[PDB]
Design a protein around this ligand. Structure first.
Ligand SMILES: COCc1cccc(-c2c(-c3ccc4nccnc4c3)n(C)n(C)c2=O)c1
Length: 328
């Protein structure tokens, strides 16, 4: 990296230099070791997330606990599986490791987003009929691109998030989104039928029925995709539940807030979800706007106690991409 070089220069050189490959490790190494950390900006599942600048340009750094190294590798590994890059998927910049033994430091660097997580966004905000769609349409677009299975040269294998939720989604300045945190992600090769990975992972609350009650067929890939959809549905709930059509809107709430306690359990969920077959209360008066209803329609077609019945990211993308046309 010679003088004058900017992150902007590095990103461009990559996203236009043959293979969808990232920057050379050597370069990633340099970037990481020269990032100037600003301050911590979040914790969670595995590792604390910091805000940092490289030669001035903001950037996001996810510093891992030496103990959660597996999550570290899975992300780095998965993002470096051909052209995973995508407008609706968090942009990988570099991955690095320093020190050794008990004090090994593992870092992942990504793009920075002032607006932060969809979760922190929906909390301190009230979206419009407009945005409510950009947010969902994009989340959909992304999940669609992840589950997609571009076969061929630099095509991408099928990918299942396994931990999709509001905290793992970020929003940009123009109101779009992008999935994040592939720590649990799972690849699936079609030319050999496989899946590099393995218990009951992911955030309890957003867990789908087939997983909560343990019966999910981990041998069939689609099964995972199905679980993603169910979650994305809970996410859509969170979004619209915060839309504001004429001053009217409900306080931000996590799925199953009024049912299960704060920070649920695998047992406390198997109850409210599997058995009692309960889903986020779709506001009655939610049948005002045509689009606002299209959502609930989908939300219902995602929460089916049967994975096989639920829609698909692609489909959801289409009907949403459509609503984008007519509405607004
Ligand atoms: C390959 O890089 C992965 C990576 C690096 C740094 C942070 C994150 C990350 C973020 C993230 C990403 C960008 C941000 N920009 C501004 C403020 N916070 C951010 C958090 N979130 C919300 N989660 C769950 C993550 O794993 C992922």
């Amino acid at each position: 990296i010679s003088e004058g070089t900017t992150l902007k220069d590095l990103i461009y050189d990559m996203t236009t230099s043959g293979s969808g490959s990232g920057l050379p490790l050597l370069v990633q190494r340099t970037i990481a070791r020269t990032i100037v950390l600003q301050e911590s900006i979040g914790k969670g599942r595995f590792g604390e997330v910091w805000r940092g600048k490289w030669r001035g340009e903001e950037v996001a750094v996810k510093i891992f606990s030496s103990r959660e190294e597996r999550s570290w590798f899975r992300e780095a590994e998965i993002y470096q599986t051909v052209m995973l890059r995508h407008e609706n998927i968090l942009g990988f910049i570099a991955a690095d490791n320093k020190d050794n033994g008990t004090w090994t430091q593992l870092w992942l660097v990504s793009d920075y987003h002032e607006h932060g997580s969809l979760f922190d966004y929906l909390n301190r905000y009230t979206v419009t009929v407009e945005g409510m769609i950009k947010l969902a349409l994009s989340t959909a677009s992304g999940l669609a691109h992840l589950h997609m299975e571009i076969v061929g040269t630099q095509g991408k294998p099928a990918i299942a998030h396994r931990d999709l939720k509001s905290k793992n989604i970020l929003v940009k300045k123009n109101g779009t989104c992008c999935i994040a945190d592939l720590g649990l992600a799972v690849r699936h090769d079609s030319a050999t039928d496989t899946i590099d990975i393995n218990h009951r992972v992911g955030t309890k609350r957003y867990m789908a029925p087939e997983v909560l009650d343990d019966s999910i067929n981990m041998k069939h890939f689609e099964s995972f995709k199905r679980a993603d959809i169910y979650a994305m549905g809970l996410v859509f709930w969170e979004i619209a539940r915060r839309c504001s059509i004429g001053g009217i809107h409900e306080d931000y709430q996590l799925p199953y807030y009024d049912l299960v306690p704060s920070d649920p359990s695998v047992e406390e969920m198997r109850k409210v979800v599997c058995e009692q077959k309960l889903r986020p209360n779709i506001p009655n008066r939610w049948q005002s706007c045509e689009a606002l209803r299209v959502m609930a329609k989908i939300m219902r077609e995602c929460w089916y106690a049967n994975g096989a019945a639920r829609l698909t990211a692609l489909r959801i993308k289409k009907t949403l991409s459509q609503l984008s046309q007519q509405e607004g």
